[PDB]
Design a protein around this ligand. Structure first.
Ligand SMILES: *[C@@H]1O[C@H](CO)[C@@H](O)[C@H](O)[C@H]1NC(C)=O
Length: 319
């Protein structure tokens, strides 16, 4: 009947979509987001990030996150909660602060414990640490790395686990879906957290790909199995496939094949729990200025009408 029903028949927990609060006043948008034949899971695109949830020190702000949870709850959709520790979308009080190891650890832990406690029981998964690596497999020189060193990562996981022992804890990153220094480094982060004795349940593979340059089904599956071999589940967490503009029939077809292989890779991998697309309509796709010249990244167009990629996904999920 749709993406989510097809995904569940193949043993995934969900097929899902991100959303954001500005979209929720569009009742036509909301009606399709709330269609559980297509979406059994929701991620808040922005309203659970640090800039949204602790915009001034110790000042927790949950209304916009809660509104997304409430919608998911009314619809019977799972939540993925996104994201606790990340160098981007950090309030200036954190990124510019004068810290010591103890004082930044206290503030980071305070952030995690308050946010995760607030959402205790509501989330299938948390992206606990996001994008900790540079493209060359080095640690990003974020405030957390510079002040605390690599321990910030296992400490964040341990802190999340103490606040909510049952939610699945994910390390989430992009450009780790194909082999290379970055994916190798992401494997090493998994091994490092586990060696520290902290709980890590999952690797989140964002899957921001490009039409015509998407990794093959075979390459993607191979890489997923490289993570599951470490004793984690995997999911594609932010899938979209931006195309070099203008859109053409040939690019829409390629885009369909690209989405199909991503779905098929997940369905092929024991321990891949689901796919989330980064919103579902091109009208609300994430295409910031750095990708000027690209667009139309999603399975529905800006008029909420299906593109060939929808059928591609269905084919990849075996329906
Ligand atoms: C910060 O404190 C943690 C917790 O004890 C420790 O693992 C880490 O090495 C410390 N880092 C620095 C730079 O002191």
């Amino acid at each position: 009947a749709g993406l989510n029903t097809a995904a569940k028949a193949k043993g995934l927990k969900y097929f899902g979509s991100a959303t954001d609060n500005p979209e929720l006043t569009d009742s036509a948008y909301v009606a399709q987001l709330s269609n559980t034949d297509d979406f059994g899971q929701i991620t808040p695109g922005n309203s659970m990030k640090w800039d949204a949830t602790e915009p001034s020190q110790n000042s927790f702000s949950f209304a916009n996150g809660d509104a997304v949870v409430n919608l998911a709850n009314k619809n019977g959709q799972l939540m993925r909660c996104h994201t606790l520790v990340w160098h981007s979308q950090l309030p200036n009080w954190v990124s510019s602060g004068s810290w010591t190891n103890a004082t930044l650890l206290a503030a980071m832990k305070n952030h995690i414990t308050n946010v995760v406690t607030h959402y205790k029981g509501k989330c299938y998964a948390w992206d606990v640490v996001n994008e900790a690596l540079n493209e060359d497999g080095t640690f990003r020189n974020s405030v957390f790395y510079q002040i605390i060193g690599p321990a910030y990562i296992p400490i964040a996981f341990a802190t999340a686990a103490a606040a909510d022992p049952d939610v699945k804890l994910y390390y989430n990153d992009y450009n780790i879906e194909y082999s290379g220094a970055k994916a190798t480094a992401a494997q090493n982060i998994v091994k490092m957290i586990k060696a520290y004795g902290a709980k890590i349940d999952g690797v989140g593979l964002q899957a921001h790909f490009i039409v015509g340059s998407t990794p093959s089904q075979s390459d993607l599956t191979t890489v997923l199995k490289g993570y599951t071999a470490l004793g984690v589940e995997v999911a594609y967490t932010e899938l979209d496939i931006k195309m070099q503009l203008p859109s053409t029939a040939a690019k829409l077809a390629q885009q369909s094949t690209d989405f199909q292989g991503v779905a098929a890779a997940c369905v092929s991998t024991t321990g891949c729990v689901g796919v989330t697309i980064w919103d579902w309509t091109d009208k609300y796709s994430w295409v910031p200025s750095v990708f000027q010249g690209y667009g139309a990244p999603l399975p529905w167009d800006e008029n909420y009408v299906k593109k060939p990629a929808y059928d591609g996904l269905m084919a990849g999920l075996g329906a």
